[PDB]
Structures are given as structure tokens and as C-alpha cells.
């Protein structure tokens, strides 16, 4: 996944239109901070939406995978 420009291009691949300013509060606006959390953090950013919360759960690993 080294073809992304910013968290906007990454969250876009997982369908996160209503998760922009939401990730800015927790600090997931780049390829690093968001690569150090789990499902407990998704519920904090405001991802109460079911399914969507578990979707980014495996996405957070896309960063630690190559890191």
C-alpha cells in the first residue's frame, strides 16, 4: 500500500468518508500515530458505527505491517 498520499487516501480505501475530522482528534491524520492502536481507539475517534469500527481494526495493521 505504498501508493497513498495521506490518511485521506488510506481511509478512502476502507470507505471512511465520515472519519476525517474524527481521526484528527485522536491523532490518526498520518502514517504513524494511527499505526499504534486497536479497536479501543476506533470507538474513541467516534466510529460507533458497527462494522466500520471493525473495518479500520485490521487497517491499522497496514502500517505496522511494513514498519
UniProtKB/Swiss-Prot annotation:
Residues 2-66 form the SAM domain. It comes from the Eukaryota. This is EphB2/CTF2. The lineage of its organism: Eukaryota, Metazoa, Chordata, Craniata, Vertebrata.
